[PDB]
């Protein structure tokens, strides 16, 4: 057991060096922000399809990460994610956590409201709660799940381990940018092998995501 | 050896990107984009950040396959400059737009154009909206190489109808951050939509898992 704490938060993690650094590059550079922001818990049901969150819009409302800096809005930041699934030893399943850079969701949803009186627009900033996927096999774009493992990824197999951390550096054509317009990457969590449990046990297994920025500059 | 499968030898061949026909307005403004013929698109999508310059070549002959001298002009506009709108517009005499003047009976022209993005590499996938907060709808970035403009030289109309093809190589490629391929058929030229009701699976099928 290890109580990793940096700043204000305190979390418990295993003593495993199963970290994966995206593209082999640590986030290098050139006070009240380096803390573990833990998101809402998503419940994995028996027939769920998958969830996705986009970055760095996930820490815009909660937190002050995208607080307007009244000087100028040039920012540059990396991240450190943590996905963990607290299940018992009688459940079974497998997850696939992967960050794919520059995701574009072609699929459209109706959104909250229209009366066929404007074309229904689409939402691409799920934000805090994330959003469910529609057709997993294609990942709401044409990409096949099969080949998702070409990006940085980690398997969460409920038989062996319940932790998966990915260190992701900054990746963009320009060194700084206006935050609200852009979205750098997307984390996806897809149940490739479905959940199963014999009747009587708990029906929904929880999933917890924890984010920690790595020196977001403003200079 | 291992050199045949390098990034340089994966895009080196030239292939036609468009066919331009001017039969008997007298001008055409063919926009430039690697996109537009499908095969290449999927190949390019292998990566999400590319950087390269191009080298075009224009072969010209009558629809029927015979040649006749008619001096032509292929005016090239850079990004941001206003495009021509008529055969005798103001743009055709603008110095800032470079052009070539070649005869139909000559060998085909060859022009190279360096990459002119304000950023450091092209992006085939942009997540945001073109615009601090979001202001308008769209999922396309701002990257382009500008249009070409082809017309005949003179005041009155040519006696003959002309057609041409534009071939394009790519050189000195570099790439970054690889991603997965595409299996669903395409539907538009700008956004990665797909057909919703029916999804074609990746592989073919068999009857039993234990077949050979």
């Amino acid at each position: 057991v290890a109580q990793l704490t940096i700043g204000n938060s305190t979390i418990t993690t295993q003593e495993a060096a199963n970290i994966v650094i995206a593209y082999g590059e640590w986030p290098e550079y050139c006070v009240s922000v380096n803390r573990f922001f833990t998101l809402d818990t998503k419940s994995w049901a028996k027939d769920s399809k998958g969830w996705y969150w986009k970055f760095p819009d996930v820490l815009t409302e909660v937190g002050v990460f995208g607080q307007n800096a009244q000087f100028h809005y040039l920012y540059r930041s990396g991240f450190c994610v943590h996905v963990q699934c607290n299940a018992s030893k009688f459940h079974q399943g497998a997850l696939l956590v992967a960050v794919l850079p520059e995701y574009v969701l072609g699929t459209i949803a109706g959104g909250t409201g229209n009366e066929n009186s404007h074309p229904p627009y689409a939402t691409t900033q799920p934000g805090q709660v994330g959003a469910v996927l529609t057709h997993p096999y294609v990942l709401d774009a044409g990409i096949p799940l099969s080949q998702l493992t070409v990006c940085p990824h980690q398997w969460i197999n409920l038989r062996t381990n319940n932790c998966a951390t990915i260190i992701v550096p900054y990746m963009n054509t320009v060194p700084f940018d206006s935050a609200l317009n852009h979205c750098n990457f997307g984390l996806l969590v897809i149940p490739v092998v479905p959940l199963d449990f014999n009747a009587g046990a708990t029906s929904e297994i929880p999933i917890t995501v924890t984010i920690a920025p790595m020196c977001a500059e403003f200079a | 050896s291992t050199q045949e499968t390098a990034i340089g030898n994966f895009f080196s061949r030239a292939g036609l990107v468009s066919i331009i026909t001017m039969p008997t307005d007298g001008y055409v403004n063919w926009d430039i984009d690697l996109m537009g013929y499908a095969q290449l698109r999927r190949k390019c999508e292998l990566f999400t950040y590319m950087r390269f310059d191009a080298e075009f070549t224009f072969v010209v002959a009558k629809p029927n396959g015979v040649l006749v001298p008619q001096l032509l002009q292929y005016m090239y506009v850079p990004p941001g400059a206003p495009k021509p709108t008529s055969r005798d517009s103001f743009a055709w005499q603008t110095a800032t737009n470079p052009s070539v003047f070649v005869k139909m009976t000559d060998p085909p022209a060859q022009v190279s154009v360096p990459f002119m993005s304000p950023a450091s590499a092209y992006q085939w996938f942009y997540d945001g909206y073109p615009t601090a907060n979001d202001l308008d709808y769209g999922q396309c970035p701002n990257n382009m190489m500008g249009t070409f403009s082809i017309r005949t030289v003179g005041t009155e109309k040519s006696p003959h109808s002309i057609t041409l093809r534009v071939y394009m190589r790519i050189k000195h490629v570099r790439a970054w951050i690889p991603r997965p391929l595409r299996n669903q058929p395409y539907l538009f030229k700008t956004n990665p939509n797909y057909k919703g009701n029916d999804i074609k699976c990746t592989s073919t099928s068999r009857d039993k898992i234990t077949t050979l």
Partner: antibody
Framework: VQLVQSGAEVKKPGASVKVSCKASGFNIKDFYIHWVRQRPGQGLEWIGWIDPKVGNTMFDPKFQGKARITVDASISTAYLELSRLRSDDTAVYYC???????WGQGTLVTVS | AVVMTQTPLSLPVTLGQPASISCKSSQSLLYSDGKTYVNWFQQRPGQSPKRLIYLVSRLDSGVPDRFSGSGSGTDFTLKISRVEAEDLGVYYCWQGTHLPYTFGQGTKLEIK
């Protein structure tokens, strides 16, 4: 289901007003709430709608700076805050969910 | 910066004859997706406006089915079987394809 609104106002140039739009029966977080205008003796105009779920607000180019739409989920309102009024901004204002279902009564404003 | 035009001014009408109000645009009003989007609104002197036609040719709780509308691509129109007294008022085009939503010039119905 009806959208009732505030009363008329008489103001001076350079001021800033805010009209109100009551919801009734239907939930406020579902439909878009558009806002339209009618200068006297002129055809209907359009300002902008609001997405009440997340907060997407977008306006016509003309009033880009001037206007500001906000929504409140508790008391179920929809405010349109004008600012920097000129002599041209005398008109009746209406709030309507989508276009068809209902609209509200006109709220005339005076800047003279 | 799309513009709309309507058949101009007023078509004087009588009790029972068709009207055929037309509306023409500058560019196609068809979205990428299959649907094309137009609406028609009617306002009685002294009341808020109301929706008449859905998409391009469908009705929603408008009891008279007289109002029929038709058209596609550049042109659109409304053919009424018999104009009852209730039908007097003003008429507008609303368009959804491009960002600046456009409301029409406005016509009048009059008795002769």
């Amino acid at each position: 289901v009806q959208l009732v609104q505030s009363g008329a106002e008489v103001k001076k140039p350079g001021a800033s007003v805010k009209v109100s739009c009551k919801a009734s029966g239907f939930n406020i977080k579902d439909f878009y709430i558009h806002w339209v205008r009618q200068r006297p003796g002129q055809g209907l105009e359009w300002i902008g709608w609001i997405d009440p779920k997340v907060g997407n607000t977008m306006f016509d180019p003309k009033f880009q700076g001037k206007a500001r739409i906000t929504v409140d989920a508790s008391i179920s309102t929809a405010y349109l805050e004008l600012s920097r009024l000129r002599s041209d901004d005398t008109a009746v204002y209406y709030c309507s969910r989508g276009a068809a279902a209902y609209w509200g009564q006109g709220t005339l404003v005076t800047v003279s | 910066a799309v513009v709309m035009t309507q058949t101009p001014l007023s078509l004087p009408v009588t009790l029972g004859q068709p009207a055929s109000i037309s509306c023409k645009s500058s560019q196609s009003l068809l979205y990428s997706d299959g649907k094309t989007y137009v609406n028609w609104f009617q306002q009685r002197p002294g009341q808020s406006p109301k929706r008449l036609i859905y998409l391009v040719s469908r009705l929603d709780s408008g009891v008279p089915d007289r109002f029929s509308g038709s058209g596609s691509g550049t042109d659109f129109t409304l053919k009424i079987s018999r104009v009852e007294a209730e039908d007097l008022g003003v008429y507008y085009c609303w368009q959804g394809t491009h960002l600046p939503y456009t409301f029409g010039q406005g016509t009048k119905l009059e008795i002769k």
